[PDB]
Amino acid sequence: YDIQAWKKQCEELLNLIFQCEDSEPFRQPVDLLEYPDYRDIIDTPMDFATVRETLEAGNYESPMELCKDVRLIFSNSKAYTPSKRSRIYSMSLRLSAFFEEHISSVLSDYKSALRFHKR
Numbered sequence: 428y429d430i431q432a433w434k435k436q437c438e439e440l441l442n443l444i445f446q447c448e449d450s451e452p453f454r455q456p457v458d459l460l461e462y463p464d465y466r467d468i469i470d471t472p473m474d475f476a477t478v479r480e481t482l483e484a485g486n487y488e489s490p491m492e493l494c495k496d497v498r499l500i501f502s503n504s505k506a507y508t509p510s511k512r513s514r515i516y517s518m519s520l521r522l523s524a525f526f527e528e529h530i531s532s533v534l535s536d537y538k539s540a541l542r543f544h545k546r
């Protein structure tokens with residue numbers, strides 16, 4: 428029932444994601460010199476360094492907000508991909524599966540802790 432535990436749990440999960448080779452295309456904002464049309468398709472860029480910085484700044488109130496930004500990294504890759512077989516998109520799907528597998532208990536524990544706080 429620790430309402431604050433999610434933050435360190437998210438820091439640890441981001442550390443695992445950064446050490447994963449599949450995260451390399453997503454560690455920093457998409458390079459607009461490499462992909463000149465990126466902002467014509469994607470309205471809201473997102474990357475894991477921005478998520479980590481937002482967390483460290485104390486600018487996430489809940490793990491749901493962090494999860495919405497991580498999911499935006501993956502939906503941006505899906506929207507930008509020219510093919511469902513592209514290398515970077517394929518990396519995003521594996522990384523998404525890994526993230527969802529680990530974030531589920533973080534979300535459950537936080538929501539349970541908040542319900543206990545308001546019992």
Ligand SMILES: CN(CCO)c1ccccn1
Pocket residue numbers: 452457462500503504505507508509513515516
């Ligand atoms: C650079 N990225 C992330 C786009 O958000 C790509 C590139 C090709 C296919 C899919 N995602």
